[PDB]
Amino acid sequence: KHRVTLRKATLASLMQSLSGESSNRVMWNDRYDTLLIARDPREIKNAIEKSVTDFGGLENYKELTGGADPFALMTPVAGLSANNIFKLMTEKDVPIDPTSIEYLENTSFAEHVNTLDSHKNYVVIVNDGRLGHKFLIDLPARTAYIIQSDLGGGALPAVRVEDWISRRGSDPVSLDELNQLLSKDFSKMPDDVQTRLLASILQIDKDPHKVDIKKLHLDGKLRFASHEYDFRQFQRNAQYVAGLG
Amino acid sequence: PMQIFVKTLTGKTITLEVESSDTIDNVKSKIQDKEGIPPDQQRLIFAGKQLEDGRTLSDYNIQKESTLHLVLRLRGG
């Protein structure tokens, strides 16, 4: 119960560094075939400069993207956060490409977790076709945490990763409730059951009224994959990102 | 027949082989396969405007060799 203090201090350190231009662009970059720690800020900035120049300059670019300045300090949508925190957590010395990971489809979350060694840390990347979402489930060496952000177009309201970590990042989540939600039967459940499950696991203030199930894809596909990780490794990767200044 | 380009705010490019009759959904779903982002989490832009599901490329007058942007961030801060 002393590592959870470290886990929080690491996540807090990481989220705060993200006010840094360098830390912001390296954390949330989208090159997956490379080690996250191999990411060079200056290089990443030249490639944006390249893009902008190629399109006729900043004003003209901001016209195309509909107002979005590629240099701004960003906050990631669910996919980009999930993919990137995934790398940051699992990588040591070999690039892991969340794009090309094989997912389990014909396996319950409940029966999958039972195969997992309890003396190891796991991170579950969840690609949820019912919510149109993608988030992470941290499984320290059972205890479970959610790492997510959300654009807000779905049943869940928009949430910035920094705010999610800060309010819900070190708040464990019911193992069994995750089993209910990460079930193919979830689509069949009573409206209020769905609503409270979503509220309890994925809403920042655990509030059923902030959830709108009408926006669910009842036929969407649930898919997930897990991966073990060294806590030391994740710490160190975090330190790299947080130390860019 | 047709070719389009999808670019992120990072300058990352992918090329998609597409038909004018293809849906935005179809496109978003092919982006999910390469960039690992749920269609619902994407901000797909063409000529300044957000592309909505249930329309086609022709509905937005996207033509050969066009570029779409993939804005992967929440609005504002």
mmCIF file of C-alpha atoms in Angstrom:
data_model
loop_
_atom_site.group_PDB
_atom_site.id
_atom_site.type_symbol
_atom_site.label_atom_id
_atom_site.label_comp_id
_atom_site.label_asym_id
_atom_site.label_seq_id
_atom_site.Cartn_x
_atom_site.Cartn_y
_atom_site.Cartn_z
ATOM 1 C CA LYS A 1 0.000 0.000 0.000
ATOM 2 C CA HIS A 2 3.065 2.269 -0.401
ATOM 3 C CA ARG A 3 3.351 1.804 -4.174
ATOM 4 C CA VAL A 4 -0.089 3.397 -4.807
ATOM 5 C CA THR A 5 1.410 6.608 -3.346
ATOM 6 C CA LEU A 6 4.257 6.326 -5.892
ATOM 7 C CA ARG A 7 1.820 5.493 -8.691
ATOM 8 C CA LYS A 8 -0.121 8.681 -7.933
ATOM 9 C CA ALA A 9 3.008 10.853 -7.606
ATOM 10 C CA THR A 10 4.238 9.431 -10.971
ATOM 11 C CA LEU A 11 0.879 10.088 -12.735
ATOM 12 C CA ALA A 12 0.638 13.577 -11.157
ATOM 13 C CA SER A 13 4.213 14.391 -12.181
ATOM 14 C CA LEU A 14 3.427 13.222 -15.729
ATOM 15 C CA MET A 15 0.165 15.176 -16.119
ATOM 16 C CA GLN A 16 1.778 18.413 -14.862
ATOM 17 C CA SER A 17 4.817 18.242 -17.132
ATOM 18 C CA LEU A 18 2.284 18.298 -20.009
ATOM 19 C CA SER A 19 2.054 22.102 -19.687
ATOM 20 C CA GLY A 20 5.549 21.884 -21.219
ATOM 21 C CA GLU A 21 5.705 22.341 -24.977
ATOM 22 C CA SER A 22 8.249 19.507 -25.289
ATOM 23 C CA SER A 23 6.502 17.157 -22.884
ATOM 24 C CA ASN A 24 3.135 17.844 -24.544
ATOM 25 C CA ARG A 25 4.365 17.012 -28.056
ATOM 26 C CA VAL A 26 6.338 13.899 -27.048
ATOM 27 C CA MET A 27 3.679 12.292 -24.855
ATOM 28 C CA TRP A 28 0.899 12.652 -27.390
ATOM 29 C CA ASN A 29 2.827 12.119 -30.661
ATOM 30 C CA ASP A 30 1.367 9.513 -33.019
ATOM 31 C CA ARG A 31 4.453 7.590 -34.257
ATOM 32 C CA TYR A 32 3.863 4.113 -32.858
ATOM 33 C CA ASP A 33 6.553 2.010 -34.589
ATOM 34 C CA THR A 34 9.202 3.779 -32.496
ATOM 35 C CA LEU A 35 10.002 3.744 -28.777
ATOM 36 C CA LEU A 36 8.149 6.641 -27.170
ATOM 37 C CA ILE A 37 11.385 7.661 -25.382
ATOM 38 C CA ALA A 38 13.132 7.824 -28.770
ATOM 39 C CA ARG A 39 10.909 10.812 -29.602
ATOM 40 C CA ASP A 40 12.835 14.014 -30.330
ATOM 41 C CA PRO A 41 10.791 17.189 -29.641
ATOM 42 C CA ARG A 42 12.754 19.415 -32.041
ATOM 43 C CA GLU A 43 12.273 16.815 -34.808
ATOM 44 C CA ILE A 44 8.532 16.520 -34.030
ATOM 45 C CA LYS A 45 8.366 20.345 -34.182
ATOM 46 C CA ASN A 46 10.170 20.466 -37.559
ATOM 47 C CA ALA A 47 7.666 17.973 -38.959
ATOM 48 C CA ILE A 48 4.750 20.204 -37.868
ATOM 49 C CA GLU A 49 6.611 23.247 -39.307
ATOM 50 C CA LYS A 50 6.994 21.182 -42.478
ATOM 51 C CA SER A 51 3.267 20.392 -42.580
ATOM 52 C CA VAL A 52 2.279 24.026 -41.997
ATOM 53 C CA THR A 53 4.735 25.384 -44.568
ATOM 54 C CA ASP A 54 3.565 22.707 -47.057
ATOM 55 C CA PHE A 55 0.001 24.006 -46.677
ATOM 56 C CA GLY A 56 0.927 27.672 -47.190
ATOM 57 C CA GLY A 57 1.608 28.900 -43.657
ATOM 58 C CA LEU A 58 -0.093 28.989 -40.270
ATOM 59 C CA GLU A 59 -3.143 31.048 -41.158
ATOM 60 C CA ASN A 60 -3.927 28.926 -44.223
ATOM 61 C CA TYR A 61 -3.434 25.718 -42.279
ATOM 62 C CA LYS A 62 -5.684 26.956 -39.454
ATOM 63 C CA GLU A 63 -8.192 27.503 -42.257
ATOM 64 C CA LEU A 64 -7.996 23.858 -43.391
ATOM 65 C CA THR A 65 -8.103 22.307 -39.913
ATOM 66 C CA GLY A 66 -11.031 24.610 -39.157
ATOM 67 C CA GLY A 67 -9.185 26.666 -36.523
ATOM 68 C CA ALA A 68 -6.790 24.120 -35.028
ATOM 69 C CA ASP A 69 -3.206 25.337 -34.582
ATOM 70 C CA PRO A 70 -0.844 22.341 -34.724
ATOM 71 C CA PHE A 71 1.555 24.046 -32.268
ATOM 72 C CA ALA A 72 -0.974 24.562 -29.471
ATOM 73 C CA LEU A 73 -0.768 22.663 -26.184
ATOM 74 C CA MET A 74 -3.161 19.796 -26.737
ATOM 75 C CA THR A 75 -5.212 17.353 -24.699
ATOM 76 C CA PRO A 76 -5.770 13.916 -26.327
ATOM 77 C CA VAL A 77 -8.970 12.152 -27.398
ATOM 78 C CA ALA A 78 -9.618 8.634 -26.049
ATOM 79 C CA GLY A 79 -7.735 6.767 -28.761
ATOM 80 C CA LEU A 80 -4.565 8.836 -28.685
ATOM 81 C CA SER A 81 -4.317 8.930 -24.889
ATOM 82 C CA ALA A 82 -4.989 5.220 -24.605
ATOM 83 C CA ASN A 83 -2.485 4.309 -27.332
ATOM 84 C CA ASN A 84 0.190 6.554 -25.850
ATOM 85 C CA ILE A 85 -0.139 5.865 -22.141
ATOM 86 C CA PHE A 86 -0.137 2.226 -23.254
ATOM 87 C CA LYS A 87 3.308 2.597 -24.865
ATOM 88 C CA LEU A 88 4.657 4.684 -21.987
ATOM 89 C CA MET A 89 3.574 1.902 -19.562
ATOM 90 C CA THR A 90 4.643 -1.236 -21.457
ATOM 91 C CA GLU A 91 7.826 -0.200 -23.256
ATOM 92 C CA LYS A 92 11.355 -0.930 -22.154
ATOM 93 C CA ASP A 93 13.666 -1.470 -25.110
ATOM 94 C CA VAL A 94 11.394 -2.785 -27.913
ATOM 95 C CA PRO A 95 8.770 -0.651 -29.720
ATOM 96 C CA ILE A 96 5.194 -1.756 -29.082
ATOM 97 C CA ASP A 97 2.667 -0.641 -31.710
ATOM 98 C CA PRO A 98 -0.833 -0.323 -30.272
ATOM 99 C CA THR A 99 -2.065 -0.089 -33.868
ATOM 100 C CA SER A 100 -0.909 -3.637 -34.642
ATOM 101 C CA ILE A 101 -1.793 -5.441 -31.400
ATOM 102 C CA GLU A 102 -4.026 -8.489 -31.652
ATOM 103 C CA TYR A 103 -7.267 -8.220 -29.621
ATOM 104 C CA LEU A 104 -9.394 -10.866 -27.883
ATOM 105 C CA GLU A 105 -13.041 -10.966 -29.051
ATOM 106 C CA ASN A 106 -14.344 -14.399 -28.009
ATOM 107 C CA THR A 107 -13.182 -14.133 -24.409
ATOM 108 C CA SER A 108 -14.952 -12.578 -21.426
ATOM 109 C CA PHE A 109 -13.008 -10.016 -19.432
ATOM 110 C CA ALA A 110 -13.883 -12.026 -16.326
ATOM 111 C CA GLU A 111 -12.419 -15.316 -17.642
ATOM 112 C CA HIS A 112 -9.406 -13.571 -19.188
ATOM 113 C CA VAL A 113 -8.237 -11.926 -15.950
ATOM 114 C CA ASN A 114 -8.231 -15.329 -14.183
ATOM 115 C CA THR A 115 -5.339 -16.433 -16.437
ATOM 116 C CA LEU A 116 -3.269 -13.410 -15.331
ATOM 117 C CA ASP A 117 -0.390 -13.823 -12.892
ATOM 118 C CA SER A 118 -1.171 -11.844 -9.718
ATOM 119 C CA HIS A 119 2.480 -11.076 -8.935
ATOM 120 C CA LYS A 120 2.709 -9.074 -12.179
ATOM 121 C CA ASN A 121 1.294 -5.749 -13.340
ATOM 122 C CA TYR A 122 -1.007 -5.731 -16.342
ATOM 123 C CA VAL A 123 -2.496 -2.976 -18.459
ATOM 124 C CA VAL A 124 -5.659 -3.625 -20.427
ATOM 125 C CA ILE A 125 -6.261 -1.654 -23.603
ATOM 126 C CA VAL A 126 -10.053 -1.636 -24.221
ATOM 127 C CA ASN A 127 -11.491 -0.888 -27.645
ATOM 128 C CA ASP A 128 -15.189 -0.584 -26.963
ATOM 129 C CA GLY A 129 -17.474 -0.529 -30.008
ATOM 130 C CA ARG A 130 -20.596 -0.081 -27.817
ATOM 131 C CA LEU A 131 -19.400 3.287 -26.408
ATOM 132 C CA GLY A 132 -17.193 4.328 -29.358
ATOM 133 C CA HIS A 133 -14.446 4.521 -26.793
ATOM 134 C CA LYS A 134 -10.939 3.320 -26.014
ATOM 135 C CA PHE A 135 -9.525 3.412 -22.513
ATOM 136 C CA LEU A 136 -7.062 1.604 -20.264
ATOM 137 C CA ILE A 137 -7.455 -0.616 -17.227
ATOM 138 C CA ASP A 138 -4.431 -0.750 -14.958
ATOM 139 C CA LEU A 139 -4.043 -4.010 -13.010
ATOM 140 C CA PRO A 140 -1.206 -3.571 -10.447
ATOM 141 C CA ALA A 141 0.396 -6.625 -8.815
ATOM 142 C CA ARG A 142 -6.844 -7.637 -7.432
ATOM 143 C CA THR A 143 -6.974 -3.871 -7.871
ATOM 144 C CA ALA A 144 -8.152 -1.944 -10.974
ATOM 145 C CA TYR A 145 -7.918 1.646 -12.258
ATOM 146 C CA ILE A 146 -9.222 3.491 -15.263
ATOM 147 C CA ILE A 147 -7.097 5.742 -17.441
ATOM 148 C CA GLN A 148 -9.089 7.560 -20.111
ATOM 149 C CA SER A 149 -9.972 10.803 -21.825
ATOM 150 C CA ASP A 150 -13.117 11.469 -23.907
ATOM 151 C CA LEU A 151 -14.052 13.694 -26.858
ATOM 152 C CA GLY A 152 -17.621 13.677 -25.521
ATOM 153 C CA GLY A 153 -19.562 12.609 -28.620
ATOM 154 C CA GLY A 154 -20.865 9.410 -27.005
ATOM 155 C CA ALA A 155 -22.833 8.312 -23.951
ATOM 156 C CA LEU A 156 -19.972 9.598 -21.800
ATOM 157 C CA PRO A 157 -19.345 13.370 -21.503
ATOM 158 C CA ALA A 158 -16.039 14.934 -22.603
ATOM 159 C CA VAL A 159 -13.190 14.435 -20.116
ATOM 160 C CA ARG A 160 -9.604 15.687 -20.291
ATOM 161 C CA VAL A 161 -7.022 13.101 -19.290
ATOM 162 C CA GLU A 162 -5.393 15.463 -16.742
ATOM 163 C CA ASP A 163 -8.725 15.906 -14.964
ATOM 164 C CA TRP A 164 -9.498 12.181 -15.055
ATOM 165 C CA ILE A 165 -6.192 11.220 -13.423
ATOM 166 C CA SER A 166 -6.625 13.987 -10.867
ATOM 167 C CA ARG A 167 -10.107 12.987 -9.735
ATOM 168 C CA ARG A 168 -10.385 9.309 -10.572
ATOM 169 C CA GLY A 169 -6.817 8.098 -11.252
ATOM 170 C CA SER A 170 -6.030 6.538 -7.859
ATOM 171 C CA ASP A 171 -9.610 5.531 -7.106
ATOM 172 C CA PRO A 172 -9.905 1.720 -7.489
ATOM 173 C CA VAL A 173 -12.824 0.334 -9.456
ATOM 174 C CA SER A 174 -14.957 -2.728 -8.696
ATOM 175 C CA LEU A 175 -13.523 -5.836 -10.414
ATOM 176 C CA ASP A 176 -16.984 -7.389 -10.822
ATOM 177 C CA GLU A 177 -18.550 -4.209 -12.227
ATOM 178 C CA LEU A 178 -15.913 -4.240 -14.967
ATOM 179 C CA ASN A 179 -17.034 -7.801 -15.681
ATOM 180 C CA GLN A 180 -20.631 -6.630 -16.105
ATOM 181 C CA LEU A 181 -19.622 -3.706 -18.359
ATOM 182 C CA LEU A 182 -17.064 -5.674 -20.371
ATOM 183 C CA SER A 183 -19.634 -8.349 -21.150
ATOM 184 C CA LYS A 184 -21.339 -8.901 -24.484
ATOM 185 C CA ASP A 185 -24.547 -9.063 -22.413
ATOM 186 C CA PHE A 186 -24.074 -5.398 -21.420
ATOM 187 C CA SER A 187 -25.949 -4.419 -24.595
ATOM 188 C CA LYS A 188 -28.989 -6.336 -23.220
ATOM 189 C CA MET A 189 -29.038 -4.908 -19.689
ATOM 190 C CA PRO A 190 -31.776 -2.567 -18.298
ATOM 191 C CA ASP A 191 -31.257 1.096 -19.179
ATOM 192 C CA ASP A 192 -30.586 2.165 -15.571
ATOM 193 C CA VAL A 193 -28.158 -0.726 -14.982
ATOM 194 C CA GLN A 194 -26.169 0.338 -18.040
ATOM 195 C CA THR A 195 -26.319 3.931 -16.830
ATOM 196 C CA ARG A 196 -25.002 3.189 -13.316
ATOM 197 C CA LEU A 197 -22.266 0.894 -14.591
ATOM 198 C CA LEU A 198 -21.048 3.560 -17.014
ATOM 199 C CA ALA A 199 -21.416 6.219 -14.293
ATOM 200 C CA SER A 200 -19.511 4.221 -11.691
ATOM 201 C CA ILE A 201 -16.590 3.208 -13.917
ATOM 202 C CA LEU A 202 -16.218 5.990 -16.484
ATOM 203 C CA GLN A 203 -17.949 9.164 -15.306
ATOM 204 C CA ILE A 204 -15.728 11.615 -13.423
ATOM 205 C CA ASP A 205 -18.276 12.333 -10.677
ATOM 206 C CA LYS A 206 -19.902 8.850 -10.699
ATOM 207 C CA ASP A 207 -23.162 10.495 -11.748
ATOM 208 C CA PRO A 208 -25.861 8.528 -13.673
ATOM 209 C CA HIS A 209 -27.437 11.771 -14.977
ATOM 210 C CA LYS A 210 -24.192 12.669 -16.843
ATOM 211 C CA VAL A 211 -24.610 9.443 -18.889
ATOM 212 C CA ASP A 212 -26.795 9.163 -22.030
ATOM 213 C CA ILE A 213 -27.305 5.539 -23.181
ATOM 214 C CA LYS A 214 -29.394 6.542 -26.237
ATOM 215 C CA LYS A 215 -26.014 7.301 -27.831
ATOM 216 C CA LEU A 216 -24.699 3.734 -27.427
ATOM 217 C CA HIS A 217 -24.103 1.415 -30.388
ATOM 218 C CA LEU A 218 -25.995 -1.610 -29.090
ATOM 219 C CA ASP A 219 -24.418 -3.762 -31.812
ATOM 220 C CA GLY A 220 -20.865 -2.425 -31.444
ATOM 221 C CA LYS A 221 -18.073 -4.888 -30.715
ATOM 222 C CA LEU A 222 -16.132 -5.172 -27.473
ATOM 223 C CA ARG A 223 -12.429 -5.964 -27.916
ATOM 224 C CA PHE A 224 -9.536 -5.847 -25.502
ATOM 225 C CA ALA A 225 -5.934 -6.921 -25.003
ATOM 226 C CA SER A 226 -3.674 -6.956 -21.981
ATOM 227 C CA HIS A 227 0.086 -6.656 -21.546
ATOM 228 C CA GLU A 228 2.338 -7.016 -18.530
ATOM 229 C CA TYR A 229 4.588 -4.156 -17.473
ATOM 230 C CA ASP A 230 7.496 -3.353 -15.185
ATOM 231 C CA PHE A 231 6.565 -0.530 -12.828
ATOM 232 C CA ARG A 232 10.211 0.614 -12.839
ATOM 233 C CA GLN A 233 10.071 0.848 -16.653
ATOM 234 C CA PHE A 234 6.881 2.864 -16.670
ATOM 235 C CA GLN A 235 8.294 5.188 -13.980
ATOM 236 C CA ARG A 236 11.440 5.753 -16.064
ATOM 237 C CA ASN A 237 9.523 6.396 -19.295
ATOM 238 C CA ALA A 238 7.346 8.858 -17.361
ATOM 239 C CA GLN A 239 10.505 10.580 -16.061
ATOM 240 C CA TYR A 240 11.795 11.026 -19.593
ATOM 241 C CA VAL A 241 8.558 12.712 -20.726
ATOM 242 C CA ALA A 242 8.272 14.794 -17.551
ATOM 243 C CA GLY A 243 11.907 15.888 -17.713
ATOM 244 C CA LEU A 244 11.875 17.537 -21.145
ATOM 245 C CA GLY A 245 11.151 21.008 -19.758
ATOM 246 C CA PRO B 1 -11.939 4.951 -58.110
ATOM 247 C CA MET B 2 -9.903 7.712 -56.336
ATOM 248 C CA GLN B 3 -7.047 8.561 -53.920
ATOM 249 C CA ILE B 4 -7.215 10.739 -50.749
ATOM 250 C CA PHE B 5 -4.775 11.711 -47.974
ATOM 251 C CA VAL B 6 -5.406 11.840 -44.258
ATOM 252 C CA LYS B 7 -3.114 14.087 -42.228
ATOM 253 C CA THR B 8 -2.838 14.593 -38.487
ATOM 254 C CA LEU B 9 -1.720 17.755 -36.646
ATOM 255 C CA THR B 10 1.628 15.984 -36.399
ATOM 256 C CA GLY B 11 2.168 15.878 -40.138
ATOM 257 C CA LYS B 12 1.688 12.085 -40.154
ATOM 258 C CA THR B 13 0.195 10.928 -43.486
ATOM 259 C CA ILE B 14 -1.672 7.849 -44.636
ATOM 260 C CA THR B 15 -3.038 7.220 -48.144
ATOM 261 C CA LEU B 16 -6.538 5.790 -48.665
ATOM 262 C CA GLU B 17 -7.907 4.225 -51.856
ATOM 263 C CA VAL B 18 -11.498 5.375 -52.001
ATOM 264 C CA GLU B 19 -14.605 5.903 -54.152
ATOM 265 C CA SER B 20 -16.681 9.125 -54.195
ATOM 266 C CA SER B 21 -19.630 6.991 -53.048
ATOM 267 C CA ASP B 22 -17.864 5.851 -49.831
ATOM 268 C CA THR B 23 -19.309 6.955 -46.498
ATOM 269 C CA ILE B 24 -17.519 9.145 -43.934
ATOM 270 C CA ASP B 25 -18.064 6.181 -41.627
ATOM 271 C CA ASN B 26 -16.332 3.870 -44.095
ATOM 272 C CA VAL B 27 -13.391 6.332 -44.069
ATOM 273 C CA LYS B 28 -13.287 6.787 -40.260
ATOM 274 C CA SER B 29 -13.298 3.015 -39.903
ATOM 275 C CA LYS B 30 -10.296 2.662 -42.168
ATOM 276 C CA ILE B 31 -8.555 5.325 -40.083
ATOM 277 C CA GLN B 32 -9.337 3.252 -36.971
ATOM 278 C CA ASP B 33 -7.526 0.293 -38.565
ATOM 279 C CA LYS B 34 -4.365 2.316 -39.203
ATOM 280 C CA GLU B 35 -4.348 4.933 -36.412
ATOM 281 C CA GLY B 36 -6.245 2.972 -33.736
ATOM 282 C CA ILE B 37 -8.860 5.597 -32.964
ATOM 283 C CA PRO B 38 -12.563 4.844 -32.534
ATOM 284 C CA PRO B 39 -14.548 6.617 -35.265
ATOM 285 C CA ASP B 40 -16.519 8.383 -32.521
ATOM 286 C CA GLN B 41 -13.299 9.882 -31.101
ATOM 287 C CA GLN B 42 -12.184 11.407 -34.415
ATOM 288 C CA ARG B 43 -12.456 15.008 -35.647
ATOM 289 C CA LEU B 44 -12.270 14.499 -39.428
ATOM 290 C CA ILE B 45 -12.043 17.801 -41.286
ATOM 291 C CA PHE B 46 -12.299 18.786 -44.941
ATOM 292 C CA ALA B 47 -12.025 22.348 -46.285
ATOM 293 C CA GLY B 48 -12.606 23.679 -42.753
ATOM 294 C CA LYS B 49 -15.669 21.665 -41.689
ATOM 295 C CA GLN B 50 -16.226 18.571 -39.488
ATOM 296 C CA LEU B 51 -17.311 15.485 -41.431
ATOM 297 C CA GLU B 52 -20.413 13.802 -40.019
ATOM 298 C CA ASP B 53 -21.426 10.141 -40.217
ATOM 299 C CA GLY B 54 -24.224 9.140 -42.608
ATOM 300 C CA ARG B 55 -22.958 11.188 -45.537
ATOM 301 C CA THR B 56 -20.703 10.287 -48.447
ATOM 302 C CA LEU B 57 -17.478 11.849 -49.746
ATOM 303 C CA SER B 58 -19.426 13.284 -52.690
ATOM 304 C CA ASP B 59 -21.859 15.000 -50.291
ATOM 305 C CA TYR B 60 -18.841 17.050 -49.151
ATOM 306 C CA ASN B 61 -17.416 17.368 -52.695
ATOM 307 C CA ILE B 62 -14.147 15.702 -51.746
ATOM 308 C CA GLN B 63 -12.322 14.946 -54.987
ATOM 309 C CA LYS B 64 -9.235 13.103 -56.224
ATOM 310 C CA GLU B 65 -5.957 13.837 -54.400
ATOM 311 C CA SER B 66 -7.779 15.647 -51.591
ATOM 312 C CA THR B 67 -6.554 15.929 -48.029
ATOM 313 C CA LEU B 68 -8.523 15.356 -44.838
ATOM 314 C CA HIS B 69 -7.281 16.277 -41.372
ATOM 315 C CA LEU B 70 -7.462 14.099 -38.299
ATOM 316 C CA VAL B 71 -7.629 16.366 -35.283
ATOM 317 C CA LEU B 72 -7.010 14.075 -32.311
ATOM 318 C CA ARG B 73 -7.691 16.498 -29.463
ATOM 319 C CA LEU B 74 -10.474 17.909 -27.352
ATOM 320 C CA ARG B 75 -11.514 21.443 -28.108
ATOM 321 C CA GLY B 76 -9.926 24.268 -26.277
ATOM 322 C CA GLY B 77 -7.464 23.691 -23.612
#
